[PDB]
Amino acid sequence: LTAGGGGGGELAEKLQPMRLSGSSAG
Amino acid sequence: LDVPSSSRYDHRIRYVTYNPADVVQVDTVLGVATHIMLEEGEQYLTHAFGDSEAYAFARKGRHIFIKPQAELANTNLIVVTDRRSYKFRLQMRNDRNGAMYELAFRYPDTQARQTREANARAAVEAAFEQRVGAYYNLKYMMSGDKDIAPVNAWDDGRFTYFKFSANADLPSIYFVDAEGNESLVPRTTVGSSNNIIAVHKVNPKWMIRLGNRALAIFNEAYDPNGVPNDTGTASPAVRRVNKGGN
Amino acid sequence: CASAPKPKQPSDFNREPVNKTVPVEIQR
């Protein structure tokens, strides 16, 4: 039908920077 | 049918200007590889050969290499990227003379652009260095600490300038409102020897501080009117146009 | 026995006109 090292942590810890990404205008 | 035009050093390097409504004639000679170079950052989508086996194809980024590999290699290539659709008429040459080794697509629109902004930048820089047609105020008095004393102070109606000698430290500059409170203003430093600090306002009363020494500057020729800045820049010689469109 | 201070209301004594000259943008 069909188909189909790191010693001195404290000072070194605080001096860790934050780097913030710049932004581009729209 | 655009005919590639050769360079003046060798005939094997030819240039062709793009056309959306014309196909490119390429007379491939036997035994050579032909380099087809796309637009910088052209993104490859798909090709199509009149004979997959008459020609050998290899691509890397915007680089294409084509080579005869069968007898009577006379077919067409329709290589399509995001931006356009190239059309090549691949006709194999029999006497192996007049080869091309690279083909170049100069785009007159893009060249026209690149020429434009360079001239524009030159004109802008020239206009900035012109710096003509301004008045200068010198009616300024100072009170208090003279050991932070600038050697000269003035204003051009849009910016206010202070000049310090070589041996002094550059203090911080503060804005005084009518009431007496202080506040911040952006500052920039200019000059051959960085001995001029410029602030982005003209105001009746300036305050200069350094540690526990405070100096006050009176602008005694205050102009409430000022010169409006229609040109959108620091100098009236240059406009600021909107590239973004939309 | 206290509440938020209110911003200074300007005085109502030396009332004067604002437009000492006619504005340019009016085309007049």
Binding site: - | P186, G232, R240 | -
Partner: protein, 49 residues
């Protein structure tokens, strides 16, 4: 090195706006303020805002 000193505002530049809405911290909300001076580029040659 900075790319273009005319279209770029460096970190730490002072945007000196004036507050619009009165601020009450009892509930978290939003603010709104409007600038009062043109913000020049770090080169001091272009109005950017």
């Amino acid at each position: 090195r900075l790319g273009n000193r005319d279209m770029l505002i460096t970190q730490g530049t002072q945007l000196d706006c004036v507050l619009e809405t009165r601020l009450v911290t009892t509930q978290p909300g939003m603010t709104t303020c409007h600038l009062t001076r043109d913000v020049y580029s770090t080169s001091g040659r272009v109005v950017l805002l």
